[PDB]
DNA sequence: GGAATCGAATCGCCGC
RNA sequence: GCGGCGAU
DNA sequence: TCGATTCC
């Protein structure tokens, strides 16, 4: 009810404290001192408002048990609620007779269950109600518990198999309301399946579930010090009654955790001046002494973070802080249409004018479902990107701090920042430009060529084609809003940007000073970086690490390989068979049609296999995808589209068939990429073997500990993969979800990706530095693989980034290196089962200097 | 040991 | 944790 | 599905 609000004294420090005033002035004056301490100001005052926001949605909604601040003390509340909710059971147990009326409900859930949900129902009830009387708070207690007891059932025994299917679409809907009409529908589909055992739920009548919750008061009152019974009116019949006596003392301690939490939450704006450098863990980006101290690295422990206060890394520090120092403006111009559109489009590029079946229906009913979900989710960050763009689009220059998360990739830490989408990368532009030339025209007009989609043909036709588009971007940069040209590319804000940079060395010439950042992106990173591990040519060749004929399309590259076998299988390969089979639940066995590859390649070609049919399970092979994978990947992004919109009449079986191209897929991938699928083998084993407690059975003794995966990047970066699990959570059907180990599968399914973007994070380092140092660049756009700079140094940057990968992977075998890091924590028995090291290939790294389409 | 079973990237914002 | 969006 | 991991 009552919050404290905590910007009184410890908000007026960042301001009004001596020292970070002094070391801020004496680097920019004191009046660019007193803006970026008043809008560091600003950012804290306008998220303690963001937490009082979603603390009053809460008390409104009676959602006040799942914040932060309510969590610290029903953590230790439930330990003594179980107790007494034993010792209730334990008291009349004992005694014969009679049961009381409600102990027989009490007693089908769980008794940790029971705990949770009288509490948070009579939290619920006072913070939304208003109301103390027992009538609707011991019916709380008692509708809830019949609603987790009823279904709670389907999860717990008879559907454990068929609760794993229905928990998604349980998880889909959103509210109480909506997840407990699902629930009937299940247990009355599952009835008429009989797989409940056949009896359906007799529901407790009204006086029952009033019975139920008078109990849970009377056991919270003994168990902890939350609640203290009061009586009211007592002797008089006709007022008799007992308040719900929430403690005003407890209601204290979450005061002090939701003011406290509300000074912890700040929102992250740009700054006006450079941001203060990094020369330790904490304390820098920002300029003052504030309650949230930026880190270097986003741990999720103070430990981690602690781990790396005394590393010597000097060439990171060096990378984040020249990527601090870019000066960054808001693009006007593109800023002056985005300003006009939104307001009338919601997305504003979104829809420009231009010239069995029950599970379909579902599968449509539930597709405008999650977009309206997506038209809110879309919209309240473009209103909220604008307003920061339009904040501080009158300064000459704008800045934004860097630090990395737990691998050692780079983000800026505004929310507003260069590493938003299109709309917020058009939004900005770098302020320090120079004369365009004719090697920075050159690079702006391939820079166009991106931004509309023009990316898989050589430079002199993504040159040609804006030429031939010239009177096309010229009128779209005349005018924005009488032709809708820009706005129809794939990157229709950012090639709206690159229109104005157009139209001025169209007017002022090669002269022209233009300060539009040309991102230069890899065409896969962590296949990129394999290949370039065990220098693989043919994988590397694919992802164009290798100086090719054209722009190398791995996607394309798959497709053609599975097409190859598709018109292979479509010859020889098995004839359709018929197979029996029973489903596990009814036990019914039938005897269904197996196809063979013939009949299934028919059908990929009666459908017609294209670098979208293959798209996302190269994507999502550096993530750890494999033949499995791919399967519900084929059945989602190809077949049930096309059996939505009238095709699909080949697919007669779905499933066959989104096996059947996962099966191919993988053996194409697989074998194009050889030295990514060798690569994330060898981690894997790693990270399975350093994850164990290998033990001795007899003995019972565990010989090697759990222990966790390290390896140092060859800029100087150390990283600790240590994913750890809990012990024990508690699952609610209808309401929310309430030491440690290392969770050993974790270890083994992020080993490899985390890595690879840790490679990719000493890469970027590298090339930031190197282009700083050997040229004289000083403005970067970074996007994680993706290297940007002005046109005048963008030829530099193409030359410094492939320079730094070529330099790295010639002087750090990080393969190796990260063998010798594990290898003497290694069990005995272990080394045995430790794969040696992938073989190295042909490809040499020198090709990469002259590789057009590598990008990075 | 042996079924019984489980499982098949990071980071940010928003909401419950 | 779950739902949704965006970035790689 | 194919392998690990996990209770027993
Ligand atoms: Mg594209």
């Known amino acids: 009810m009552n919050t404290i609000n905590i910007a009184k004294n410890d908000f007026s420090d960042i301001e009004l404290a001596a020292i970070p005033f002094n070391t801020l002035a004496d680097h920019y004056g004191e009046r660019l001192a007193r803006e970026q301490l008043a809008l560091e100001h600003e950012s804290y005052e306008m998220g303690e408002a963001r937490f009082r926001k979603m603390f009053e949605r809460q008390l409104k909604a009676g959602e006040v048990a799942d914040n932060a601040a309510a969590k610290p003390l029903i953590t230790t509340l439930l330990p003594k609620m179980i107790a007494r909710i034993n010792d209730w059971f334990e008291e ?48 709380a207690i008692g509708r809830a518990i019949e609603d987790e007891a009823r279904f709670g059932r389907i999860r717990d025994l008879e559907a454990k198999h068929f609760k794993k299917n229905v928990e998604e679409q349980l998880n889909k809907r959103v509210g109480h309301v909506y997840k407990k009409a699902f629930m009937q529908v299940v247990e009355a589909d599952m009835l008429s399946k009989g797989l409940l055992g056949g009896e359906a739920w007799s529901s407790w009548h009204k006086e029952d579930s009033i019975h139920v919750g008078v109990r849970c008061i009377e056991m919270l009152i003994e168990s902890t010090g939350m609640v203290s019974l009061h009586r009211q009116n007592a002797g008089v019949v006709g007022q008799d009654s007992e308040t719900i006596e929430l403690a005003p003392e407890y209601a204290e301690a979450i005061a002090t955790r939701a003011g406290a939490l509300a000074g912890i939450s700040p929102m992250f704006q740009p700054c006006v001046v450079p941001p203060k450098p990094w020369t330790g863990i904490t304390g820098g980006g920002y300029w003052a002494n504030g309650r949230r101290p930026l880190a270097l690295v986003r741990t999720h422990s103070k430990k981690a973070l602690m781990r790396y206060e005394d590393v010597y890394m000097p060439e990171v520090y060096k990378a984040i802080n020249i990527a601090q120092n870019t000066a960054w403006k808001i693009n006007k111009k593109v800023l002056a249409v985005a300003n006009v559109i939104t307001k009338w489009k919601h997305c504003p590029v979104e829809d420009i004018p231009a010239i069995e079946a029950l599970t379909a229906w579902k599968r449509a009913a539930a597709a405008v ?77 391939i820079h166009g060529a991106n931004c509309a989609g023009v990316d898989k043909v050589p430079f002199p036709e993504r040159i040609k084609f804006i030429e031939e588009n010239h009177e096309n971007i ?27 940079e157009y139209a001025g060395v169209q007017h002022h010439g090669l002269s022209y000073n233009c300060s539009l ?30 100086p ?27 004839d359709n068979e018929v197979v029996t089979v029973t489903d596990e639940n009814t036990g019914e066995i039938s005897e269904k049609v197996k196809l063979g590859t013939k009949a299934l390649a028919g059908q990929w070609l009666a459908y017609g ?76 084993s790693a990270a399975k073997l350093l994850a164990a407690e290998v033990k001795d059975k007899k003995t019972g003794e565990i010989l090697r500990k759990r222990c966790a995966v390290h390896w140092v ?52 380092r590298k090339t930031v530095v190197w282009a700083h140092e050997k040229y004289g660049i000083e403005s970067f756009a970074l996007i994680h693989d993706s290297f940007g700079t002005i046109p005048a140094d963008a030829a530099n940057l193409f030359k410094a980034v492939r320079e730094t990968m070529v330099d790295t992977y010639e002087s750090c075998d990080v393969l190796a290196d990260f063998y010798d890091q594990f290898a003497d924590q290694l069990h005995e028995s272990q080394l045995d089962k430790m794969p040696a090291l992938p073989a190295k290939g042909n490809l040499n790294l020198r090709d990469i200097l002259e590789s057009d389409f590598a990008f990075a």
């Open 713 to 764: 990047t060859p800029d100087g970066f150390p990283v600790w993969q240590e994913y750890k699990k809990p012990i024990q959570t508690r699952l609610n059907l209808m309401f929310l979800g309430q030491d440690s180990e290392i969770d050993a599968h974790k270890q083994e399914s992020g080993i490899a990706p985390n890595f690879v973007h840790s490679q990719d994070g000493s890469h970027l």
């Open 474 to 500: 010229m009128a779209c940069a005349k005018s924005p809003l009488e032709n809708t040209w820009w706005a129809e590319q794939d990157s229709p804000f950012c090639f709206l940007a690159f229109c104005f």
């Open 369 to 445: 479902y999650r977009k309206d979900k997506a038209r809110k989710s879309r919209r309240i960050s473009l209103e909220f990107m604008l307003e920061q763009a339009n904040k501080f689009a009158n300064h000459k220059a704008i800045w934004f701090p860097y630090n990395m998360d737990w691998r050692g990739r780079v983000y800026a830490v505004s929310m507003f920042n260069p590493q938003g989408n299109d709309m917020t990368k058009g939004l900005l532009t770098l302020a320090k430009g120079k004369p365009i030339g004719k090697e920075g025209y050159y690079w702006l007009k």
């Open 92 to 139: 009349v147990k004992a005694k014969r007779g009679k049961r009381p009326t409600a102990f027989q409900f009490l007693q089908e859930i769980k008794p940790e269950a029971v705990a949770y949900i009288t509490i948070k129902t009579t939290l619920a009830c006072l913070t939304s109600a208003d109301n103390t009387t027992v009538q609707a708070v011991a019916s």
């Open 548 to 574: 090719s004929e054209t722009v190398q399309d791995i996607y394309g590259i798959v497709a053609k390989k599975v097409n190859e076998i598709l018109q292979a299988d479509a010859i020889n390969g098995t």
């Open 609 to 684: 296999v294209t670098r979208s049919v293959t798209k996302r399970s190269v994507m999502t092979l550096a993530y750890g995808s494999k033949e499995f994978g791919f399967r519900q990947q084929v059945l989602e992004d190809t077949i049930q589209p096309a059996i939505d919109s009238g095709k699909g009449l080949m697919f007669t079986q779905p499933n066959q068939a989104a096996g059947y191209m996962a099966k191919l897929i993988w053996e194409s991938v697989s074998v194009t990429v050889v030295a990514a699928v060798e690569a994330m083998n060898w981690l894997k």
């Open 517 to 546: 950042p040309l991102a230069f992106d890899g065409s896969c990173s962590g296949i990129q970086h394999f290949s370039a591990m065990l220098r693989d040519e043919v994988g590397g060749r694919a992802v164009n690490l290798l």
